[PDB]
Structure formats: C-alpha cells, structure tokens
C-alpha cells in the first residue's frame, strides 16, 4: 500500500543513541561539495533500528555541524567522533544520489530503482 506514496523530501531530524558502537551505514560523496549521501544501511545496526534513514538521504548535519559541503574523510570523522548520541539532519535527494550508483534511476514516487 505504501510503495506508491511519495517519499517525503523535507529535512528531518533523526536521533540515534549508539553508545560506543558504529552507526551502521556507509556514505558516498564529499568531492568538491557534491554532498554526503547514505549508500548502504546495515541490517540490524543502529541506523536500521532508527527506522528513519534510507539510501539516498543526504546528511545535512551531525550534532549541529554542517556537512553539506564536507569532504568525504572529514564527514566520516565527524560521524565517528560525534559521541554516543548522534543527531542527524537528513534530506532525501534521490536524483543526486542516483548519479553515484550504477544503473540507478528515480521512479514517480521518488524511489531509487536499479535495473
């Protein structure tokens, strides 16, 4: 029933409490201000358990630190050093994301499809 509803494109706040364990997602991007995007979310990891992040989300900030224009390595450092409670502002940007992943495109509901 859900799969035809448009994925919301407004920014959201996500709070993940992960102690001293990994967040459980991978990032792509960071070159020349392209943005930092979630590319993979580990099943059973803290990001998965949040239920509030998906592939193709841009990370706008972590703990108030603006990552819109971050480099890949400094983004990764910000995330890994954010502390036990990690407050992410995210925004779903599937068109931008789709340019990174082979054979990917965005459908009418905003979902990323890979042929």
């Amino acid at each position: 029933f859900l799969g035809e509803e448009d994925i919301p494109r407004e920014p959201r706040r996500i709070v993940i409490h992960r102690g001293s364990t990994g967040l459980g997602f991978n990032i792509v991007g960071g070159e020349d201000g392209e943005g930092i995007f979630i590319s993979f979310i580990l099943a059973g990891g803290p990001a998965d358990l949040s239920g509030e992040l998906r592939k193709g989300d841009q990370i706008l900030s972590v703990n108030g630190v603006d990552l819109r224009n971050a480099s890949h390595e400094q983004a990764a450092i910000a995330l890994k050093n954010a502390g036990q409670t990690v407050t992410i502002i995210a925004q779903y940007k599937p068109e931008e994301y789709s340019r990174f992943e082979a054979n990917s495109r965005v459908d009418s509901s905003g979902r990323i499809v890979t042929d």
Binding site: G22, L23, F25, N26, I27, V28, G30, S39, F40, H72, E73, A75, A76, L79, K80
Partner: peptide, 6 residues
C-alpha cells in the same frame, strides 16, 4: 570513489 563505514 571512496566509501566509508561509519
């Protein structure tokens, strides 16, 4: 090209 696990 980079991908980092966090």
């Amino acid at each position: 090209k980079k991908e980092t696990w966090v």
